[PDB]
């Protein structure tokens, strides 16, 4: 009942409402010292958007994902699954990373040291952004513990820009391969629909072709691409068409549906995913929490494919 | 209709009754074939409230549809085949859910006993239960065609719970689950009842024509009650609802499905869970309004 | 008076105590789409028109928004702070919205003037909902023929005395109205003005800067003096209110009146002989939680109460 | 210690959980708390717009704007130095059952008061105040009501669960004394010949802060006070996020100054109600409620 | 077109001309191949107004696209092939629709005569009628490739009505209905007027290639005027529009259907009916911005390297 | 004019480019301008909500509501007739590099002031003012700060790029004299024991505009004044579009009257900061900022004569 959500309400009463007792993601228990806990998975918020080239507001993403997640908490077995992920995984929400707002360098180092300490304690990580730069420190900690990783990357942009400043949310996947964190030749970038480089190692499955092909065919290609490398899964929510995810800093039309998106994440269940994150929710631009809702449903789906093991 | 009873070609002005249809606040002894009733109720919601403003938002946006003499893609005017009146909204003591339930059933029972039929606007989905209780008394046991992200077959809810109507309605002999279909479902459901659950995942993958064919086989020749929860539509098309769930139907798939149910003997129908407080540029109200008009056009198709 | 109190404006003719449902006619007053031969003392007309706007359009939705939000004021049997019910003292019907070819401002002008003259020539008085402020000029033309030259009690951030610009221009009515002998500038006051105006015309401009500092009683005393004892036409542009209170308008100007000051000022005009009145420039596309519409509905209701006070 | 790694969060954004990032205590009855914050996610008794059920969460979320202030303006101490405040979460009741809410909130309130704890409560619609008054009156006896609202809510022929009937019922049950009670900001039809003293928005906006405050102190005398604040007391310009808005209301300046000047009153319990986030604009209603809520703890801390 | 003529790689700053292109308020005598004109006008609307803010909304949001050297999925920069200038917005007395109509045509005739081509941002769809009057003088009778939820072939109506241009234009001999296609229609339409209607229902169920294959067959060898009404897109993608109709196109299918008209002789074009007061997080304006950029790219593609 | 064909645009909508439809001058250093408007699209220093980067563009777009007034109320002349004002667009820095912003803004500010141009700057968060003070202090010497805000921003234990620290760093670096400086509208925890005179929101609301202006004039005396206006000085009802809102602020009425009354002061530079359009409601925050911006140009034109 602790690790379920029966235990994070007033008087520890099971809150059946899709509204009340909205604190931790999915009403999962708060543990602000997660390093010595009995958690299998530790949810972290990264309230950061200093590395944005478009709209800011990403700093409020972790809160929005948590707030809207009460819509999913009532499902004992989250559809369409035949078990409860809370019975299989012990998940805690450790709150948001504390850093000096206006110091991206302090954010970077403290986030890297946070992950390094979790991973060294045998805890796995589901992380909420924040702009997509937060994924770089996370990959620096993950590469140290799990080795070089295949990147499964849901996005409208490839973020492989070579001539940006240090704190730039469009330069993580130029920097990660350069530092030997990820292998481009085993990495896949799904839903791309902005200018990208073709003759790097990355396999780009653009939104045009992904919206035309079947989910099972895209999945089969992804399964082959990654091989047997440990996967880091990163979902930029601007992968979804702005009709489904208006609340992003860099929106691009001709994106994926929320249906196609959840089906693709659902289908990655057989892979070795060591870490994952959902980034770039900007609630200042969200409409009736639909962007936040997509991020939270995808976040819960990521936990369910780990529980599927 | 309008000031000076002048034909209003605008998509804006003289927004009163749904589709600028005549207001008849005493519709029981009227010449009407079909009666539009608003149920301004959301006390049985488990998610967001705001459903109480549902009927108003659906009426206001319906001016967008009114100018169409023949509504696309139909070859006739449904107003030339049906006398439809808008009888206003149910008056009940707000905060008294029991009084709502009693007054809605009596209203419906009085309408049906006058040989009138009912297109109802919610309001949360609990309003369907009083509507089913009255329809059952006049039309007997019914087949349920139920568009939704949720099955609403919960057995441990309080009396006024918008997730319990289709646990209670089978028990009360109002509907036959074995001839009932549930379309758009994408939240935890009990597989081991009579209902055929056509989940959003498969309905989005399958063809519209092969979904329709299967619905027809299930319902058979039973008289249908057509209930449309608007959170069936993906929050991208229907943000203005109390319990949104991602991975839902497009408005295109939704209208095509409702359009292809014309051959069924549909005795009653409603559109529920429109929450204008959460709606964006009236796109949810519009979908609810357009689907409601489609329901009158499939009745007119007879 | 049950018909005119809104006991017959709901399903089964049941009194709706809720601030939500049966939102049709303003304040749930009965719909009369042929109001000319009715028992109505006062007739409410929507003018869904914004073609004459210089800023944002969307004024055309003003009438509908004012009606929908007005259910918030219906539950009060005696509207505060009055000790009677205006619905029991006045027969008030809502005749709906003016039907005109959208994109034809001339037809709007002619049909509105024809509609108004027919109401006045039937012994009815008019409370009109805009729409942009140009709707006042057709209404002033109808009123001028029936009651004679009037005193304009004008609430606005703008004087709208522009002697240039095209015919269908919502900043020109009160240059045109004096020229056609519809109003007397000498007995006219413009309240809330905080945009460039002509000082040396006959109008008395009580700018928002001084109106915000001065007492209500003192502004009221001055307005009473300016009008004299001529018949008054009361036009209220909602953008008179600060954007804080009325964000839903086409031409917002900061440093406006509070809703508290505006409702008090109209309340203090009760002694004046107001022969016709309107509320204009509600643009619901730019409104925020119906706060502009609510202001327009309350002020419009106050205009009916200061007629009922007599 | 309500942040990751128990670090001091100087931002006005991060770690937005308990009100003002105060410690979460879901079993606060046997705790060390002087004051307990409860959320009541309820809006079934609403006559206008619903959406009050999200009130508690929106007040908590926006309260990150106020937490960075060690001495919240304009005070010369920290209320966390003098008071031990805890956020006990939201009342768990069956959504659709108004009776379950009422009984469980009274039981919650009665256990807190019997345990020596005092209650700041966020609504939710104003009906929640009656179960809270029922609890308070058992423990503290008959009370004076300092009531901020656009409405007097003294309706006599409403249904059981009506957010406009509490202050007909509360004198009827001997919970409050109208003769020592005041209703500040009323600008809607009210009954004149009840014991209540109504300081309507019209006279309050015209009169000075000091002369209004002095009159309120005269009325209450030395009676134990229950302070209740319906946010629609504020003008829709300042509080657009509410179920039943009325124009010609109080400014946030005048409102915070009135609450700040009630500090020498014997206030035994208080609440802030009718925040409806669905109708809010950039959280300014939530912020006003949240700021008023902290002000109420500071006037308690000043003692 | 930035402070100190520095390259602004941000998706935010220096949002003046469409895609930060140079402003040329007197473009007639310039080196321009393609001139962008804002027509801030919505007086002919029968639904909501606010289309007057369309051009500005399209310009502001266009910063999201400027950073792309080669706009996806193209293999060239359209700016390296076409000299493009934004000439600002048409200046007419607000409340005078005839002045707008006369000045928009007069402006259009001057550009065409000087050897400039036109990409025009609306504004309600009536702006297309004065444009076809200028284009039909310079290019003769044209084929209309029409993206819309409405056919706008309404006989009757007033003079200035955004649902009548394509009843008026054939009568005056600006367009040939028999070589004209109307894609995305999902409201009452006239079946026998020469126009080939491809309704949203069939468009959504058919393949992009097979619709493109048919559109080529219809327009023939005629010079094409491409007019995109943004309400062609489903309100889920284009909520900021005066007359929304449900069951529209995805932005995906829309850009895919335009992208596949690259071989057609498109002489002029416009994007209309963006009403920013009803838009949500600039998604309608962004669709209008992205589609406008695509229209320049199918001209940059059909023009050589 | 800055319109299609250089025509007079009397509309409050169209040709929305430079602030108040003033001419765009991207190289203003050698121009005939008296006053230059610069956008600083930067919000990286914020401790609350971000969005300030879009502030400059929002202020420009809303300023069309003010341009039609030849003599802006309640003035008896045109500032555009007395002052030569240009908009030089927005500062171009690598987004995510706060250091580059600071250095490039100072160098830009020093170059303008070295050429005899005066600065009206739009933020962006309030940190942008520290680079501006460094530049002004080099050309004018130590200045009296007239500072409208809900916050004093004198925090001594923040990171380098922090929007709540400028007026601790500024007096330390000899840019401003606290003893001749005033902070108007404060309603948050503040240090009382610094040289600054704090006129908190509660007292300013209770006092007459006359007696407050009288106090400010005495404090500054005859030192060169830098007028910096954080828009959150206004109550969130008037300015919801801000990053760190605080209830119980000034009305837009009181705020303009207070600025209007500073006309006799020697104000050498000025800025308006912390407009976050993501949190604005029907542009009312941008309008207030744009109107207060225009008022600052009028009190300069008034003093100039
Ligand atoms: Mn990314
Ligand atoms: Mn991205
Ligand atoms: Mn349902
Ligand atoms: Mn449902
Ligand atoms: Mn006016
Ligand atoms: Mn005006
Ligand atoms: Mn109340
Ligand atoms: Mn109240
Ligand atoms: Mn069209
Ligand atoms: Mn259209
Ligand atoms: Mn500041
Ligand atoms: Mn500040």
Residue numbers in the entry:
A (entry chain E): -5 to 303
B (entry chain F): 2 to 303
C (entry chain B): -6 to 303
D (entry chain D): 1 to 303
E (entry chain A): 2 to 306
F (entry chain C): 1 to 305
Copy out sentences from the published article reporting this entry, exactly as the authors wrote them.
Agmatine amidinohydrolase, or agmatinase, catalyzes the conversion of agmatine to putrescine and urea. Agmatinase belongs to the family of arginase enzymes and exhibits the characteristic 8-stranded, parallel β-sheet sandwiched between 3 α-helices on either side. As a metallohydrolase, agmatinase is dependent on Mn2+ ions for catalytic activity, two of which are bound at the active site in high- and low-affinity sites to serve in activating a nucleophilic water molecule for catalysis.
Here we describe the high-resolution X-ray crystal structure of the E. coli agmatinase, SPEB. The data showed a relatively high degree of pseudomerohedral twinning, was ultimately indexed in the P31 space group and led to a final model with eighteen chains, corresponding to three full hexamers in the asymmetric unit. The protomer of SPEB comprises an α/β/α sandwich with an eight-stranded parallel β-sheet between two sets of three α-helices. An additional α-helix runs roughly perpendicular to the plane of the sandwich structure. The hexamer has D3 symmetry, with very little structural variation between protomers. In the first two hexamers of SPEB that were built into the model (ABCDEF and GHIJKL), a pair of unambiguous spheres of electron density, presumed to be metal ions, were visible in each of the chains. The last hexamer (MNOPQR) also showed likely metal ions at these sites in each protomer, but the density was not as clear. As such, these regions were modeled as a dinuclear Mn2+ site in the structure of SPEB.
